[PDB]
Structure formats: C-alpha cells, structure tokens
Design a binder for this molecule. Structure first.
Ligand SMILES: CO[C@@]1(NC(=O)[C@@H](C)C(=O)O)C(=O)N2C(C(=O)O)=C(C)CO[C@@H]21
Ligand SMILES: CO[C@@]1(NC(=O)[C@@H](C)C(=O)O)C(=O)N2C(C(=O)O)=C(C)CO[C@@H]21
Ligand SMILES: CO[C@@]1(NC(=O)[C@@H](C)C(=O)O)C(=O)N2C(C(=O)O)=C(C)CO[C@@H]21
Ligand SMILES: CO[C@@]1(NC(=O)[C@@H](C)C(=O)O)C(=O)N2C(C(=O)O)=C(C)CO[C@@H]21
Ligand SMILES: [Zn+2]
Ligand SMILES: [Zn+2]
Ligand SMILES: [Zn+2]
Ligand SMILES: [Zn+2]
Ligand SMILES: [Zn+2]
Ligand SMILES: [Zn+2]
Ligand SMILES: [Zn+2]
Ligand SMILES: [Zn+2]
Lengths: 264, 264, 264, 264
C-alpha cells in the first residue's frame, strides 16, 4: 500500500468565473471573478491592487488592468486581506510581471513568505507560490498612493495577519467611505484550546468590535457573498449589501454557535 | 564637504564585561556579561538559550556553555526577548556554530530577518548580522524542550515583537516560577502620533497589564538593572530584585512622565 | 468558460512505495521508497540525511530513522542533490520536527526558498512547501559531520544548483568511495537558446566531465534506475549498478540525441 | 578586560565626495561620488540604476536622479556588480523610497539577503542593511528595460556573484558598446587552499578570460581608478581609460604576483 498522491486545491467553478471590470466608485473597480474580489484603484500616480484571488488568475487580472488603461508597469502597490491561496494566489507572478511592491503586516508577510504552507489550521493542504513583502505595515498605519490614503485595521482571527483596509473615494464628486474587510469565518477551525493559536477566541471577539467601528459607507469582502454583494448583476451588485454592524453581528452569532457545538 | 562616515554601535564597557556562569535556579544560568542577560537552561534533551546580547559575545557565550558541560551541538533552541543588537546580536553566528533553531513571533522574525535595520525608531543606526527564525510562535504558545515548558507572553511596546517568557524551574526540589520579561522602556521614542507605530501607547498600556499578571516568583530582564539585579555580587544578585507589579508600576510612571513631557 | 482548476503533482505509485532501510555500507542506508533515494548516514555525533523525496514522505523517513536508533533530535544535517519536489519535498517538515540544518549552494537555496516555484522549465507546475538553507556551500567545500567528510561537486544542468556529493565509508573495515550524483536528465527542456538558461548546454557538457572524474567506487542517484540500482531486490541492489563513466556516457548520448532532435 | 567595541566600516573621504551627474553616453550617467561608480540609464519606460555605493548615499543618489528629471517612482530596476557595502549599500533604502526591483544572480542574492554579513573573506566586518532580490538572473541572460538590453556576464572571484553588465547606447546617434565590469581584485584574500572558497583560483582565471572577450568600446568599473577613469575632470573623464584586455591583463599580473607571494 503506497503512500497517497498529493491533492490539488480545487474550488467551486464559480470562484474561477472571469468577469469584466465592475465599477464600485469613481476610482475603485472589481476585476476579479464572480465570487472572488480583486479591487483595483486608479490614481494619478499609479494603481493599487487589493487581493488577487486564486493563483491562476494573474493572466485575467492583467487583462482587466489593460482594459482600464493600466499598463503592467503602472501597478505600484499590492495590498492583501490575508495570505491565503484564494486571495493571495497570484501575488508572486504579479510581482514578476508588473514591478509592483507588496505591503503587509508581519503575520501576513511570514505566511506569504512560506507560500501559505504550514497553516495554523490547514497545514500544507493549501499551498501557493511564495512571495516576499517589501514593506511592513503596523495597525492603523496610513499608506498613501497618488493622493488616496489607505488605512489598515488589524482584525486577526481567520488568519493572524487578517487586515481590513479603509479609504475614501468619490461617487461623481460625492465622497464615499469604502471598507474592504477580511473574512470573519472559521471553517473547520478548532477554536477552544488550540495549541497553534492559544488566544484565538480573544482575537476573534476583538475583531468583531474592530469591524463594527470601521468608518464605512460601502462594505466589500474577499468573498462577496459574505457581505451580500452580487457581482453578476452588475449595476445592482451593491443592492442588498450589508452594513459593518450587520456583517459583524452575523459573523459573531455564527462564531458563538460554532463555539457552542465545539463544547459538545 | 563629503558625506559623513558610518558610526559604530558603541555601548558602555560594563555591557561587554564577561562574567562566569551565575546560577539562578537548578537549571537556569546567567552566562552573559555584567549588564547583559543571556540565560541558559540545561535539560535532559538539550539546552535552551534566551538572548545573546551584543553580536561580539558569541565566543564568550560558547565558553560558558562549555564550562557547564554543554557542547555546541547541545544547544537546541534560541529564544529572544526582542530582536535588537544588544540582545539578539550573536544569533546569526550562534546558529552557524551550534546547529540550534530559533523560535520567535512574526514581528520579531521580520525584525531579525533584516538584521535590526529599518528600525521603527532607530532606523539603520543599530544594525547587526541578520538571522532567520525557524519556528513562528503565537501569544501564549507553549514551547517544550526536555520537559521544561516555556510559555510566551506578548508584551509589545519597546519593539512590536517584545515577548516575555515564563517557565517553572526548581530550587533544590522546591519549584520556582521564573519570568524573563522584556524591557518596558521607550528611549527617545516619539510616543504620541507616530506614523510608523500608530497604536504604540495602546500597546504599551496593555503590556503593563500583561507583566503585572505574569506568573512570577523571580523576575529577570535583558538589562538586569531594570529589575534591580546585580550580576556582580554573585550570591546576592537576586537580593534587591523587584516583583512584577513593582517593575510594571515603575515603568508605567516613567512612561506617563515621558508622555507628559512630549505634550509640551 | 471558467478558468481551469489547479493540477496536483502526481507521480508513479512506485515512487511512493515505502521500503525498509537497506544497507549500502557500514554507515550509509537507503530509507526512501522503491524508486526514490533518501540516504541516511549514521555517525558518532549525529546523522546526515541526503534528500527526502516527495513531500508526503516525512512520516516514512522518520519511521526508518527510528528503526536505526536515530531520534528526531539526532538528525543534524540535510544535504540535497537538487531542490525539486520529488527530492527536496519534505525538507520543510523535516526541519520543524527534527531540529536539523540544511546545507546547499546559492542556486539550490534560492530554489528551495521559493518552494520550487518559478522553475526555469516547469514554472509553477511542481510546487512544494518552501524551506530555508542555514548554510551556503561552495564548489569543492568539505562538510564534516561526526568524522565523515562530505565533499560537494557542482554539476549544474538538471537544475542550476545540482550538486554531487562524495564521501568515504567502510565495508566491514574496507574503505569504499561513495558518490551520490544528481540526475543528468533534461525532461522536456528546451536546450538550445533558452532565455531563462542561456548557458545550459555548456553547463551540461561540463557536468558530464565532472561526474566522469568523481572519486567513486559505488554510485547512487536520486532515481535509482538512472544508475541501475534495484532497491527491491535488497541484497542484489548494487548488482548491475553502473560506474561513473558509464552513467555519464549514457546520459551524454541521450543529451546529444535530444539536442539533435531539437534542431529539427 | 572587557570585550572590544564594534568597529564601523570607514572609507577614504574621496569615496564619499558627492559629484554632479556626469554624462557617459546619450543615456548613461554617473551619479555616484568621485571614487564610487553609480550608473543611471534613462529609457522611455523608466530608469535603471547600476550600483549605489556606500549605504549613506541614498539621499545623494535621489538628488541626482531628481536633477535628471527622474522621479523616485521612475526607477524601475536596480542592477549590481557585487553585493558589497561600498557598492550595494543603499539598495535597501532605495527599494523602500523608489518602488524599484532588484535583479541579481543567486550568489549575489544570498549575499545581499544577509546584508554582506558572513563574508567569505571579511566575515562580519563589513555589514550593510539587507535587501531582497526580486528577480534571479542567469549567466548570459538578457534584461530589457525600455528598449535597452542589459546582458549579464558572470565573472566570479572578488565575490562568487560578481557580474559584469554590457549594453549598447548611443553617442549622438553613433552606437557605443559599454561594459560595466566588476572589480578583479583580491584584497587580503587567501587565494590558495581556501576552505570557504575551494575553487577560487579557477574562478579568477576564468573571469580574466571572460572580461577579455567582453563586447566593449568604453569600460567602467565600480572603482573608477581600476579602469583609469577620472570622474573629477568631467569632460576628460574617459581620456586615459583602459581597454578590456588591458584591465584584465593588469589585474591578472597582480593576481599572479599576489599568488606567488602567498606561496612564500
Ligand atoms: C483556505 O480557503 C478557505 N477554505 C477552503 O477553501 C476550504 C479548505 C475550507 O472551506 O475549509 C478559507 O479559509 N476560506 C473562506 C473565508 O471565508 O476566507 C471560506 C468561507 C472557505 O473558503 C476559503
Ligand atoms: C537599541 O538598544 C537600546 N538603545 C540604545 O542602546 C541607544 C540607541 C539609546 O539609548 O537610545 C535599547 O532600546 N535599549 C534599552 C532597553 O531597555 O531595551 C535601553 C534602556 C537603552 O539601551 C538599549
Ligand atoms: C520535476 O520532477 C521530474 N519531472 C517530472 O516528474 C515531470 C514533470 C517530467 O517528467 O517532466 C524531474 O526533473 N525528474 C527527473 C530527474 O531525472 O530528475 C526525471 C527523470 C523525471 O521525473 C522527475
Ligand atoms: C569590501 O570593500 C573593499 N574592501 C575594503 O574596503 C577593505 C576591507 C580592504 O581593502 O580590505 C573591497 O573588496 N573593495 C575593493 C574592490 O576592488 O572591490 C577594493 C580595491 C578595496 O576596497 C573595497
Ligand atoms: Zn482563507
Ligand atoms: Zn477564503
Ligand atoms: Zn532595545
Ligand atoms: Zn536594550
Ligand atoms: Zn528534478
Ligand atoms: Zn527527479
Ligand atoms: Zn568589494
Ligand atoms: Zn569595493
């Protein structure tokens, strides 16, 4: 009986369904797939990319950037929600082909540096090509690119380095506060008494209070279904989207119900 | 007028004064200098080293390890308080000559990986040879070597990755709770409104409460004067040493007096 | 038409067939699989491991090390032929669970650091968890562990960092020169005019002359079929094994026949 | 008798004497100091920087780049001759402030990654802030930026990763072949029987033949005195500059005279 073969990280086909650039505000665009969020922000001095999705999406992300008049050498900065394969997948290839830099916290950097291997909960089951972080950011640090200021808010839980980003864009002159908040889920996580994450419950609770107080008028998430976005319907994509308090309150009730069944 | 020459990190001569191994408990020893703490813990499966001091102390640390019957290949683990040159200096050379591994958190790892360069407060003024961290530890994670369990307690402030360590040793059969707590000082730090550390005051305050609640019967610090240790007097080294509440309360009063003068 | 799913690196089942430790000489053992070579060398000061095979073989390698009386904390050094997933797979997990160090050249280190991703010929198709190299070795450098000296011989071609290792063991007192030489194959490689490897043909030719002059009495390869070893037959495993000149001459004829068909 | 203090890497004041941009050809400029070469190449798609000199020269290099109409976000690529502190010093700070990427071979990358520490000949005596290499280049690989193609030629010896660069510029329409070749010196090196560099003499000899065959009409070196450049005299800077054969022949005679005195 020989050892088993390696298994590939397979996702639902909807996660890999390419879509044309969808406009969120005057400067923010969705260039990912139907169920994976990859936000592009066009500024006067370059473009910022938030997440990239699965690792095989680098060619698609470059296509949509070309459609917005953004050359590869115009991507200046890559920001991440958390360093998982379905969000930070193409960061390695995107760095080689665009000349951009990556800014993330220490926890996201060390997870990104080892390609998501040795995950606290998944181990080596979900591995993507590694990439280095050129700039280390702290909680509440302001990253400015082309006049648009990005503020990081640490919300650990899903991963230790889970970071929420906030920035102010315009909607035909009217300012709008956007908040790209990370996932607040714990799929298959051992919450209570985890030797690899001893203070996980504390971090999750404190993160719920963090996203409740986020300066937010329009909320987006790495998985658009978590914030009730519908990238397929285009114009009405932000129709039934949730607030920050609602998304936090909904996630916390699921965390307590999950924690309760774990003590059984 | 040519550009200035580089300046070397010079310390007081007392920091570099070698001393013979001083016994703290049945398994814990001080093998550093008179004013720099480097703790060695002998176990049945190997030895653990906490800090190393200045980078030019690797030869001295190996001498004292040889005196305790510890071969270079017997050092199994290196733990750090924070990745500064006067504490984590010889970690690079100690790894090459002992075959040991380093365990630190993400913030200490990224600071250790770039050799203390690009410090949040000191910049490139205090640079030491870089070294990689083989194991990443979380807050409250238990690291066991030879039956002795080391528990990490995150106390950020002096550095983002400042970690306090606790373990239980014996004093001729009687158990003793030891707590090696990091420095709680902010020398020349801009505390209020620091763009490189926006939540520094919050982290400092929460760290004072962390060291107050540390399970501690005997307290040691990277600088022994901070906890009123006197490594010169040998037997009476722990005579006038401070408690955890006293060391925290003394450091917090200095933090508030420093914060008050900063708003002036 | 959504983007395709990721494909897993699948190998022949014979590559993953566990086998009991096979004795090569007084100190050298085969602890890998039937068709993947993982050499263990027991010394008075510890054990050296050459290669590990596929990444899912860490548990098997530890089992055979336990059978030879080698505890996890007794593995002191890991040496590699080249940093590919079917040879350097478990190096990341083996470092975390044994406390060993890795010694490889610069080319093998940078390939090992990015987990085999961005291969010069395979791209991201063959990815394994990354690992760092603690010691950098040069061509002809001697690495000594427990009295047994390992000499590295650079033989680039299959990978830029392909390294052959030589050491002298005994066969019941009689000395024997062992040479673990890397693969001299180019499967699917574009040999002529490769923009990612412009001097590949020169490196391959110079490597044939390198393995011809290797001090060798018994030859082993990462794939035992390349040197006509038969790990299944146990005692007669080295029966029809090839010399160094024969293995080089056989590989060079295949390289020229491959280069000839490429110019057609 | 306490341990000695750390010593700072001090150089001659002429090495740190800032100078205004000196024109080499239609696109190549000297923006370093009087005795340290830092070449800037302006293209239609950005600027390439070859070397940076001492680490405290980042502010000066940015000043001269601003004088040539080159914004910080216009530096796209950094190329190195070898990763020593007097050539690769400011690469870390230049990456943080310009958003550029670094391209170097594996040997230069691993030396650049550890900040020049653990030098094969100097140890930890000459340490600069570390920096990562975003792209790994092979011998003879072509790097194109804005139509100008840079070809790397490995010439190991001074350092294992010593790389010479060649590119074709114009002199008011007339093409000119420029060759920026590394230093061919061995200051204080143990040449014969070096355990850290066993094949050093072979690499030095093969490097002399490499620079002799370099496609070169105008030669420059990291130290301009090595190729008889005089950056002070401005217009007549290339007056008495040497050819490639002359610079190689002069360096080889010094290598043999140095090797002869070593065997005495
Ligand atoms: C690592 O990627 C994830 N996990 C998986 O794909 C498998 C392994 C799983 O469900 O256990 C993960 O975390 N995600 C999230 C999230 O909310 O971030 C959700 C909801 C589930 O999908 C991705
Ligand atoms: C980086 O090393 C330190 N700083 C210096 O040496 C100079 C630069 C300084 O005083 O500003 C630093 O922090 N230390 C501590 C500590 O408590 O940790 C104290 C009390 C002061 O000494 C060391
Ligand atoms: C990356 O691993 C290899 N390649 C593959 O598995 C597939 C991708 C392939 O054949 O192209 C590779 O190289 N090997 C060797 C070797 O001789 O080293 C041989 C003979 C073939 O198997 C492994
Ligand atoms: C590490 O920097 C160098 N060495 C020194 O500065 C001291 C340490 C020394 O001379 O031994 C080094 O190599 N250089 C070269 C070169 O040709 O590259 C020459 C000629 C000498 O200066 C620099
Ligand atoms: Zn996830
Ligand atoms: Zn996810
Ligand atoms: Zn300090
Ligand atoms: Zn200190
Ligand atoms: Zn291979
Ligand atoms: Zn193979
Ligand atoms: Zn040099
Ligand atoms: Zn030099």
């Amino acid at each position: 009986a020989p050892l088993p073969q390696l298994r590939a990280y397979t996702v639902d086909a909807s996660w890999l369904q390419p879509m044309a650039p969808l406009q969120v505000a005057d400067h923010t665009w969705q260039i990912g797939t139907e169920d994976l969020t990859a936000l592009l922000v066009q500024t006067a001095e370059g473009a910022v990319l938030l997440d990239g999705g699965m690792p095989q999406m680098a060619g698609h992300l470059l296509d949509n950037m070309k459609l917005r008049g953004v050359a590869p050498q115009d991507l200046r900065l890559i920001l991440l929600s958390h360093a998982h394969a379905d969000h930070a997948g193409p960061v390695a290839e995107l760095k080689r082909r665009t000349g951009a830099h990556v800014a993330a916290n220490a926890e996201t950097a060390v997870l990104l540096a080892r390609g998501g291997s040795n995950d606290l909960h998944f181990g080596d089951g979900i591995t993507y090509p590694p990439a280095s972080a050129d700039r280390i950011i702290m909680d509440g640090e302001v990253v400015t690119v082309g006049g648009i200021a990005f503020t990081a808010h640490f919300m650990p839980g899903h991963t230790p380095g889970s970071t929420a980003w906030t920035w102010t864009d315009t909607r035909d002159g009217k300012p709008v506060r956007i908040a790209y908040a990370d996932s607040l889920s714990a799929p298959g996580y051992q919450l209570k008494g985890n030797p690899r994450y001893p203070r996980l419950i504390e971090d999750y609770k404190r993160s719920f209070a963090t996203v409740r107080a986020l300066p937010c008028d329009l909320l987006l998430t790495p998985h658009p279904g978590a914030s009730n976005w519908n990238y397929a319907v285009g114009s009405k994509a932000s129709a039934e989207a949730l607030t920050c308090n609602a998304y936090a309150d909904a996630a916390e009730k699921k965390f307590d119900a999950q924690l309760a069944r774990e003590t059984a």
